[PDB]
């Protein structure tokens, strides 16, 4: 349904075959499905219609909270406590958002594996590639910080990685 965006959680076009009866015998599954429909799906639908009718008479909205962007930990003086506090809060929010991004990608991967059935090893290559990329990025950013993590430790990790990459690049240039 329209509850979620179908671009963030995509699905294939859902091709299903038409029934081709080849026996004179009746199909018990169809008879049981008709019984289940008429006996379960209709009263539930009526109850849902009543509940939605009651809901439409009382409609109110809640809004997603917006946050502005503040200076990062790089634009803060060494002992400036207030700027450090704002930067740390913003960094923590970004960490939560990145965790949720990884969660979305993992949900895509699991849904693909279940959906594709016996052809999952070939039909889910793109989702596996996306998860590998996002996992590599996330791992670089936050792994090994440990408990008592902060924006300063993440910055130190990034600086160390940049220094190593610069040295490797300059030594490969001399080759």
């Amino acid at each position: 349904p329209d509850s979620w965006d179908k671009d963030v959680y995509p699905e294939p076009p859902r091709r299903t075959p038409a029934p081709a009866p080849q026996t004179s015998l009746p199909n018990p599954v169809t008879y049981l499905t008709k019984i289940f429909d008429l006996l379960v799906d209709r009263p539930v639908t009526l109850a849902r219609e009543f509940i939605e009718q009651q809901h439409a008479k009382n409609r109110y909205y809640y809004y997603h909270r917006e946050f502005r962007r503040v200076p990062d930990i790089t634009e803060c003086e060494e002992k400036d406590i207030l700027c450090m506090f704002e930067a740390e809060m913003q960094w923590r929010r970004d960490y939560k958002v990145d965790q949720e991004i990884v969660n979305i990608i993992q949900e895509r991967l699991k849904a693909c594996q279940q959906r594709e059935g016996e052809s999952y090893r070939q039909n889910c290559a793109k989702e596996l590639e996306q998860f590998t990329q996002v996992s590599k990025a996330f791992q670089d950013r936050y792994s090994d910080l440990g408990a008592h993590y902060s924006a300063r430790k993440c910055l130190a990790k990034q600086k160390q990685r940049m220094l190593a990459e610069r040295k490797a690049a300059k030594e490969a240039a001399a080759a």
């Binding site: 790089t74 634009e75 060494e78 910080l145 408990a147 130190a156 600086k159 160390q160």
Partner: protein
């Protein structure tokens, strides 16, 4: 070592220099004063209990005098304590202002230019 024993202009047994009158007095609802009154009330209760009298009801005049005396002493005690701390801060700031070489304000460095070692936890 005595830090304030011989500070120029100090009167030997004053307990409250005239300079202290320039500071805001403690409010009568100061929680420290309330704690001193609590101490006086506890002293009154212990006085009742030691003398084998009904602890809460025995002497109301005595308990009132206890609370009043503790509050009365505590008010002047707090005034003197606040005066001493104001003196300490005044002297500190004057000395820092008069010796600029010993208290330099060096250049501020942002965290984007300071190299901090990263220690992985694994």
């Amino acid at each position: 070592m005595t830090m304030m024993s011989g500070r120029p202009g100090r009167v030997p047994l004053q307990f409250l220099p005239n300079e202290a009158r320039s500071l805001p007095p403690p409010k009568l609802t100061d929680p420290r004063l309330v704690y001193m009154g609590f101490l006086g009330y506890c002293s009154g209760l212990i006085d009742n209990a030691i003398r084998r009298r009904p602890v809460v009801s025995a002497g109301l005049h005595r308990q009132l005098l206890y609370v009043t005396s503790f509050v009365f002493f505590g008010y002047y005690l707090l005034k003197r304590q606040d005066y001493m701390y104001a003196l300490r801060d005044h002297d500190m700031f004057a000395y820092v202002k008069s010796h600029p070489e010993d208290f330099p304000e060096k250049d501020k460095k942002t965290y984007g230019e300071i190299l901090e070692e990263f220690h992985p936890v694994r």
